[model samples]
Target chain A: VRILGYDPLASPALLQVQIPATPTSLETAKRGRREAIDIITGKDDRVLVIVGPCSIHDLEAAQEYALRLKKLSDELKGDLSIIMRAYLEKPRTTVGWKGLINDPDVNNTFNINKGLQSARQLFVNLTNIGLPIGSEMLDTISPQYLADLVSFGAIGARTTESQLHRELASGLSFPVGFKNGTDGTLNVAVDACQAAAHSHHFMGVTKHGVAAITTTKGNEHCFVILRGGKKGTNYDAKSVAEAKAQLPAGSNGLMIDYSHGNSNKDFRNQPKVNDVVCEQIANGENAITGVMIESNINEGNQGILKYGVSITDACIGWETTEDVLRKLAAAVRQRREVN
Target chain B: VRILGYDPLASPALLQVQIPATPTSLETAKRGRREAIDIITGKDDRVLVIVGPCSIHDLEAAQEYALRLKKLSDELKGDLSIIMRAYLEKPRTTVGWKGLINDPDVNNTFNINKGLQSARQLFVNLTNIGLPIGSEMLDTISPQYLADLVSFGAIGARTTESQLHRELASGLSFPVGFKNGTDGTLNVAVDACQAAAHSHHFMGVTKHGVAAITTTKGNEHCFVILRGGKKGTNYDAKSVAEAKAQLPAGSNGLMIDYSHGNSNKDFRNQPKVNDVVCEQIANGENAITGVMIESNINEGNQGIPKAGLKYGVSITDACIGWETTEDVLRKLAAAVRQRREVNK
Candidate 1:
């Protein structure tokens, strides 16, 4: 009924709206990622190191980091496959700032229109630079806004059990990674991947914000990411092995997150964690296909406007990041040579 | 196991931190709300009318609105019982500004410390103005910050099915209302109210930000709200009859929202819909216990950047403004009086 000036729940004129990117783009990324994974594990004689910021709060800083990372990736092409972490959403334990797309101002001035534009622009720019981007899908509508530009999608441990998120993963065209629950259990991730492999019909909105029932074909390119959780850090060899053992065979493989609980959410310990992971690779334990790292230009984080502070969370900057990257690349090369 | 740094799994030391207002506070609020709801439904022989902003964006506006509403409510106390809408957290359909407490800024600058301070300050301020307040508990943890200051609580339709929200409701001290689903189903609200009346144990944060596996002794002061849905306005008599039929024997009566899906998210028709609700109430319809109105100082909403050019809908929440609020309040009082006269 057009009783109102604009109907928020009305369906769009066309029921058959464009849904996903063709398998061609997805296939290219999958192959590239698999090849990268092989190199790190000594199976293909190359390195796979994914490094970036804790979260993308500044677009200019992200672009600069991407440029620097691209140059370094080309110079060390034989060693590592660089992927940028251009995150637009941040979910907190309680009430706080939602993310870039939710609120752009430090005050309570919500300019979401600007936030959305900035997020998509960064995604398109980074993708155009020939660097595959990785992001944690915090909000459900996030993919609808920038799913095409994404190569690897991650479901954070905080939302791993969410049926909405499981449905989102099943509908994603590219490879999706599920993080173990915050409690440090891999069962949730394994179960999540299994659930995502099946088709689903759920609630969704069209491009124009019209609400309707949405159906989705299953997406099988799902993997697990072992980000150490609350029980204790799971970044060490025995821990990763234990987590892998807990996962079911349906998962494609696992990824390692050197950030958050893994590094104990400490910027200083991240490189040490990565180095440990690299040592495991050197020792020929490459069950994991990739790694998620948080890196910046500086060594650590700045606060978020206690009058112009760093940001919402602490992060490791660019110089320290580059050093860590070099070490990781060298480790992968050594792993390959030894193999 | 205790570990270095923040660990969500371990129950923190602050797990037992009690909210200043406890089961006793909730008990008193429940009795007062019952009396208020009764008066509004003409059962207690007074009209139930809720007033205030679509949401609390600024503290000054909130206090001012409360003062104005308080004065008006006192003047009409014989005919009406009024409560102020002091929404702190907001739920969004797509992506946009959530609420003052969620992100105080339009930008990514998240000042949680400042947001929390403002929310608590405003809650304490409005409650002291002799005004009972209503708010939606969008976030499960946010209640720990300001739930003590609230008189009425609502679980939005979007989160009606979430067990997490239901768990939250089950422990709340005051009377709570659950809205129908976004797609329009009274069953969801009924289910939510039923769940809220049961006991539950779940993970929650204490006042000092410590993790805890909180347990709640079931809440009996729970009810439902009719906010229409995708199938259009559910504020009609037919909908009321259906809602009343669905309530459990111990269930509190229904609250009707004149905005949102009932008014069809249309700013212009909110007053019309509100009028229709009062008319049905005046006709001695007993299904309704209270009515919720989204009103501000102005007729319709103006966008944020309160300095920027005014847009139609109230910032993030689509609402009806002040002139219409005055008219609606007068009409509602008349209707309640008519019902009382007819009964006499």
Candidate 2:
């Protein structure tokens, strides 16, 4: 009754070192992170699009989606820098499938040991295939295993104010998109940027699986993501300008989401949300630098009866993905011409 | 401005491996944690007195104090189970020297890499000398380095409501004393007990220094330590019974601290506070299982001086002098015997 601790599983260093990115693949990951930062800092003129499934449970589907996005990313190379969403951890308001990393079996037999290796394996395949991947850094633990393969990172709207989350973001290796609160507050997120941009010492593990005090030099590549919330959709132009005003003295403008509270739970409406963001960018919205869309091979969420479909939030279909991509691409071109 | 990150210094595993505890010290540590539970659960019938200096600065002073406490601990072994406060990490009112671990030197160089080793080494010396040691788990990261050597753990008044703190306590290896919130809200402390006694998943580091999710089976030996609060004193009989009523099932009673809000800020009154607890134990206050006293060799406290300062005195809160310490121990011991006679 006192306590039972899990004996060490395969360490984060174990899987990552065992199955690693090829040299060229490593270049892609490094380049993606830097380009994403460049876009955030306004050095790179192209807008960054973070688009993919709400959660990754199907490896084959993930493969197909990444292959398609890689081609599309090259196609839109002139106007946009797109990173595939290889999110493995999906947080809950209360409960459900935590994500692929927590229950890869998805039947409540939380064999997280297998999930770590599986999660790392999936990330390695994508990175080696030459795609820049993005994920939400939810499990402060699993990030140690898979963050090297990840190019872009985001904190969800739900955890914007958690001191621990902010501290985690402070030490993260790459640029982070700190989402506004679920209630649509922006100051907390602005404060999060301020905090993450500073040096901090927190409890973290090393590559050797030993517990030690982690000293991070501070991640200055942190930016704000307006995913909207219960307060209302912030994808509109007025909300965009308001959110951009509080971004601190930074290398970022704003990254708006076409899903979540913005789409108001209707998957089809996400494309319409994209349309508003595109129109603003077309109208010379210099403060807007990024856009996020929940997209999968098949549209809508299915709680997992269908493959290539989301098991979490509803996602835009591949056709709508293409539609949004070119439209966002055209908007970037329009903004470029205006500038 | 570009950021500056400190290079990783000594791993907790490195220091812990190099300065491994003596075999007997491990036994002392394990037994001490169990007996502490025993006292809380009414199995041992001896009251647990968590008494010692507020924070350690002088290693020589700590060894001398530990040796002295060892002799006293053995002398009172029949009537009381005592654990020394080998508190190294001290939290601030606003901010001060975070503690010896954060800044081992009295001056400004924060040599935490050396401090962690110094802290663990001192722990080894004390436990090997045949005494139980307890500390407040403040730095969420440092526990991995030193927790094995600690028999009893306490969460401070400042952090009783922290979700991360409760999550940390759930995975702790030893029994933890959850102090009431400084403003004196007992509900949060009670809530913490319920939370810590259940399994949890949190981010933490492993022995090898890698980051991973730690799964805890929950700490059933968790108990409430009433140090009173700004709202008022909770050391009286009514407060003890009220707090005990709120305790969840299976093991342990209440622990009251003689210092802090209970003495209402005057350190001399800590022993005065202890007298009230002693009389209650004499009167068979079975709900009261343990007492905490802040005691040191020379008594009181002082900000560190460049020279000639008494190393044995507390640098943070004032402490009861050694004469007062021995007297409190004898009184608590007699009260336990009186409780035994009355219960018999």
User: What is the i-RMS of every prediction?
Assistant: 19.1, 5.2
Query: lDDT, candidate 2, residue A314?
Result: 92
lDDT of 1 by residue, A26-74 (tens): 4534554555444433365554555777667677777778888888888
DockQ (CA atoms), all models = 0.02, 0.16
- Stretches of candidate 2 exceeding 4 Å from the true structure: A1-5, A11-14, A93-96, A139-144, A157-171, A199-204, A208-215, A229-233, A261-269, A303-305, B1-110, B118-141, B148-169, B173-204, B207-215, B219-344
Model 1: residues with Cα > 4 Å off, grouped in runs: A1-339, B1-45, B304-313
Residue B327 CA displacement from its true place in model 2, Å? 23
- Model 2, clash count? 9
- TM-score for each prediction? 0.50, 0.64
